[PDB]
Design a protein around this ligand. Structure first.
Ligand SMILES: NC[C@H](Oc1noc2ccc(-c3ccccc3Cl)cc12)c1ccccc1
Ligand SMILES: NC[C@H](Oc1noc2ccc(-c3ccccc3Cl)cc12)c1ccccc1
Lengths: 188, 482, 479, 185
DNA sequence: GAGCGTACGGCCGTACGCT
DNA sequence: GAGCGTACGGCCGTACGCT
């Protein structure tokens, strides 16, 4: 499912994570295939905060991401074996985009924290009002979102590791009451 | 800096999702009982006048129209939501009239949307009645190229009637269906006594009434659910023990619990027998047919006590199932756990609003029309002068000014007279105009009486609910054993 | 009781005939299969025109499946997608927004994701569809009317081409250059007895959207003569310095899958079945265009490796011309000239019928205006007649009897508004009436003289050629 | 995907072959589940006249039909091990119905000829498709032994049958094309 | 437990003729 | 051959909370 770039120099390579083959195809047309790889996922990914480790390692989407990055996970994680120095989360401009974004960030923070620390995790910002990236044309998707000359990536910065541990456990954890409390407190 | 704090990103991203799933996906509005996708389907049926009198239209046509104009999401999400509204075993009062394979109780899905056709049910007209009389607020659709209704008039109490189940974020909803007759008697009781107790309401509303019928064990769960919005209700299959010949008996099941899969439930029983985990069952057949209705037969060994096997089946299979009541709906756009009385109060208040606004609108339109008829009367009564005035006028603008000046007419009345057709100068047409004008004056007076006295208006709500109860009310199906 | 032989023969014939006349073979007139025609007509009925904004594909497919095409959503959507691909259709008939696939054979995104409308040239396919130019027929359930054929104001069968697997037969017609085609039709329209050879001075050969090369005129000639011929297509490839060389491919043959073609080359190298290739990259980008690079070992001969690649991969492909289309509802193997003759005859019919229709409508309107003129000229009497009338029915009879009016004219006068009795309004009516009489006379000149029609057709074809004509892409190499 | 009947007496049992789960569900509701089984197929079935034997025996729809009948195929075919004495082909009243009918008949004639000889193969006659009908109406018109109108497939001339299957369903296109032109109306 | 019901998604067969 | 392009078809993943 990975459409890899020609360059084997990680320092100048970047991988784009997209919601499906819908966005996958539009992206593969738009991209600079010299330095820009594409891994299309298959919708909602496993919530690793709730799931047991057996299920996580057997998950096909989790496996493809580990293989693509080539860093391994947890203790065996090796930042120098990284195959891209920019992992770009490019989810649609909608609410289910925001959910797949929180689910991926939960995976990166629990299994590849040093990737976030190194500043290798970024968040693309497609212009709002198209349905998703499966609804954009490749010419326009390149110029706004993927072209290093005009694009606006957000670099994910981890400031407080204690506050981060509490936030992932509250939003993505199995305890419903803390999550519900957070929503009521922060509603509107 | 294009730089973004991971904590800020998580909190704002997750909140955007969570809030959206709560107020615009998974939870129904307390007023019309509808989630967005349901509302958009019924409104889409209405905008393409797919009414009960007109013939069934292809589902792919309906799903395409709804997805294009109102609901920017998957065709499967829309079609499956429409299918469920058409299943007489899912919806106590079906809102969609289906033609073709819309599934069975065995959990085989509906055929694909290419294969099926659909329209409104007669009762869905009551959900939409007066939607065009400024009774509910419209809002822009997702792309701003269309107007969609924020809520339906809902001239019957649909949230409780049909019920609702929905997994949101931080919360879910599970509301059982009810008997429409019992509900409307409940609302009438409440509309006469604002201070009515849950206990008194339950003399009208005995408990849930599932489309699949069956039995509810006791009033404890029902009471707790109507008191607090949360309660467990024990549902049970209607089963009897009967002689099958040769002195051997059998258990016959004719009604199963709500939302239980018949095919799956039989497989659990066959699996208990295969695995020798229940003793005495010699055969298991599904003799269900359109002629007989639901009929699951369990043959019992000659030695064996059939009543003991039935009690074991209840303990060990979905032949007895709990319905976990969790009455969460949107009230002023926010999720609230509501008791039976809050749900009925919010509904009655919605009806008072709809009928008041309808009356205000009917009065507006009637007055505008009465004003025009006053102009046409003057024009017909002095038609010879009107013609000369218009003939000596060079342009429409001059004729408008001359008519207004000469006959003391408004701009609206002068426009109406210039738009009048020659066929309106016949003898019968002058009488027809004065007939309409006299009826209009009585109607305007009737409408003003309603807006003047809230008790008159509330009685109109009571009377229209009673008409719906008499046309669509039906017998209880689920027996509540005390 | 049913004989197995009788059941087979009647059952299979029902299927076979249905696949031939109503699925897989295009009509010779508009070049369209049923599914294509129903999509373009569906776009037109919901006024999804180039000027208006893109509508969701799921909305379009639903409407088409509901009203005209009682078959799978996938069959409809994929047929619409292809019409929108600039690498499939030489003159795209659908304007797509979103992922409508690539040359690598990645599919279009699902119909929930994409939006679509007409292309400016699809207006020419539909022009005058509402002027009784083509026969309508009942749809599958009899609740709707659909067009049997489109006006097709440009020759779409040859322009865009057509491939279709039927039963007992298939079709394979290559796309053509529109400019060359229309020059061909003009030549034919001046000389009914024209030779295929003379037509080929206008129509050099196929013109694929993907460009590339055709080897020789032998295959092309045989195909245009007889309706059957093999045409050898070849990638545009050069050898260039990289002191080592490389083969660069910038254009591939028509309907060849880029991703698959590269995999065949990699597979020949993996399986040591071709000698001398040291690397294989696809440097294609939307900015650079198509660019497949094949690195050659130092002091390996690159020309020999290129000739081997042609023999052993789709880098060279044959296009098997099999020009079968529906003529008077029956499949016929047709030569280039039959295809152009049937098209020109369709145009003569469409323009004649349009003119007959315009005349009909103008005369009906002139008749109404004659009634309004009489009514305005004796308005005082007309009013009294209507006023003394008790019902509309009595007024109609009295007006007809008293003023020698038709039922249509009396209806028009009863429907006339009072604002039409002002001074400027009488002049406005006589202005419209006089212009109408000139128009009726212009239309009758066209119906009277078949040659006057032809001269008009020339000018409207020339306008289309000037707006839509474009350069050849596929080079045809002699020898 | 087989919904079998309760009775294990083949002489009074019948199996209905339908185009998909569309018709499958409508049929399963309509049927007398005591004596009427249903095998919903998955669209166009393999043309066994064109296909190689390896592919035929590996085909999942061909396998399900062999398993359902329990007779086996070719030489090992045993008419007495038949689990139904009525195999009913119930395809839609359209052109793609007629094709799936010719494809099934080709399978039965080449691999289970004695089933046709024994008069066990029938053709239902639904009154656009039956995937679009309700179960109540599908029973009364097509499946109810009291009012239904089955056609029993009778094999008269085995030589003429062999030529007809080879011409319509065989790999030789020219004989098929000739037949269509000759019989076109 | 597992599956309820709106949401984000994906993957496989078959016929037909021609080269 | 193996794949072109309309047709007949089908089957699986994920979130979310509560019983
Ligand atoms: N009343 C307690 C609680 O309310 C909420 N839970 O989550 C929420 C998220 C958002 C809002 C909201 C508040 C203000 C404005 C707009 C909005 Cl959208 C309210 C709640 C509850 C939940 C479930 C059941 C019973 C009670
Ligand atoms: N016209 C030459 C000849 O015709 C046919 N071949 O197969 C056919 C099948 C059906 C019909 C037909 C006849 C009457 C009405 C409707 C129809 Cl569809 C005609 C032909 C031909 C042979 C070979 C190739 C191309 C064309």
């Amino acid at each position: 499912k990975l459409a890899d770039c020609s360059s084997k120099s990680p320092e100048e390579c970047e991988i784009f994570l997209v919601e499906g083959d819908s966005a996958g195809g539009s992206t593969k047309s738009g991209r600079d295939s010299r330095t820009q790889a594409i891994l299309p996922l298959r919708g909602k990914i496993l919530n690793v905060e709730k799931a047991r480790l057996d299920r996580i390692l057997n998950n096909n989407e989790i496996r493809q991401m580990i293989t693509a990055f080539g860093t391994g996970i947890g203790g065996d994680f090796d930042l120098a074996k990284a195959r891209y120095h920019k992992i770009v989360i490019m989810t649609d401009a909608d609410v289910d985009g925001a959910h797949i974004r929180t689910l991926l960030l939960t995976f990166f923070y629990r299994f590849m924290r040093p990737l976030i620390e190194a500043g290798y995790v970024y968040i693309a910002q497609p212009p709002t009002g198209y349905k998703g990236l499966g609804e954009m044309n490749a010419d326009q998707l390149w110029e706004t979102t993927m072209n290093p000359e005009h694009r606006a990536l957000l670099q994910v910065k981890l400031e407080d590791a204690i506050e981060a541990d509490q936030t992932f456990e509250m939003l993505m954890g199995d305890v419903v009451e803390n999550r519900r409390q957070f929503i009521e407190d922060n509603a509107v | 800096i294009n730089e973004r704090n991971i904590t800020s990103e998580m909190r704002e991203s997750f909140l955007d999702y969570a809030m959206s799933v709560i107020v615009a996906r998974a939870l129904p509005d307390v007023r019309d009982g509808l989630k967005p996708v349901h509302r958009r389907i019924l409104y889409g049926l209405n905008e393409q006048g797919m009414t009960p009198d007109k013939s069934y239209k292809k589902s792919a046509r309906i799903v395409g129209d709804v997805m294009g104009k109102y609901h920017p999401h998957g065709d499967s999400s829309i079609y499956e939501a429409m299918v469920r509204m058409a299943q007489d075993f899912s919806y106590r009062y079906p809102l969609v009239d289906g033609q073709g394979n819309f599934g069975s109780m065995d959990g085989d899905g509906a055929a694909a949307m290419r294969y099926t056709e659909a329209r409104m049910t007669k009762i869905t007209l009551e959900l939409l009645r007066d939607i065009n009389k400024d009774t509910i607020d419209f809002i822009d659709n997702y792309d701003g190229n269309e107007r969609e209704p924020s809520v339906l008039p809902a001239r019957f109490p649909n949230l409780l009637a049909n019920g609702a189940s929905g997994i949101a974020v931080g919360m879910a909803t599970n509301i059982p269906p009810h008997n429409l007759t019992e509900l409307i008697n409940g609302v009438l009781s409440l509309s006469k006594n604002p201070d009515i107790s849950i206990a008194e309401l339950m003399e009208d509303i005995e408990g849930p009434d599932f489309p699949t019928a069956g039995l509810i064990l006791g009033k404890s769960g029902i009471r707790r659910a109507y008191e607090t919005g949360r309660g467990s209700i024990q549902m049970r299959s209607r089963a009897v023990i009967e002689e099958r010949g040769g002195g051997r008996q059998r258990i016959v099941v004719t009604e199963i619990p709500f939302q239980v899969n018949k095919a799956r439930m039989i497989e659990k029983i066959a699996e208990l027998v295969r695995d020798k985990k229940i003793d005495g069952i010699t055969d298991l057949r599904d003799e269900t047919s359109l002629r007989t209705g639901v009929r699951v037969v369990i043959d019992v060994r000659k030695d064996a006590n059939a009543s003991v096997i039935l009690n074991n089946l209840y303990k060990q299979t979905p032949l007895q199932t709990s319905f976990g009541v969790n009455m969460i709906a949107l009230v002023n756009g926010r999720p609230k756990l509501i008791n039976l009385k809050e749900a009925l109060v919010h509904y009655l208040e919605h009806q008072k609003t709809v009928v008041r606004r309808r009356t205000q609108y009917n009065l507006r339109k009637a007055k505008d029309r009465a004003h025009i008829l006053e102009g046409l009367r003057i024009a017909l009564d002095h038609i010879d002068e009107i013609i000369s005035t218009i003939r000596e006028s060079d342009t429409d603008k001059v004729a408008m000014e001359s008519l207004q000046q000469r006959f003391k007419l408004s701009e609206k009345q002068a426009q109406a007279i210039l738009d009048m057709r020659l066929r309106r100068l016949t003898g019968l047409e002058r009488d027809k105009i004065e007939a309409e004008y006299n009826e209009l004056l009585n109607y305007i007076s009737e409408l003003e009486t309603i807006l003047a006295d809230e008790e008159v208006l509330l009685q109109l709500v009571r009377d229209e609910l009673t008409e719906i109860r008499d046309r669509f009310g039906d017998d209880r199906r689920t027996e509540i054993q005390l």
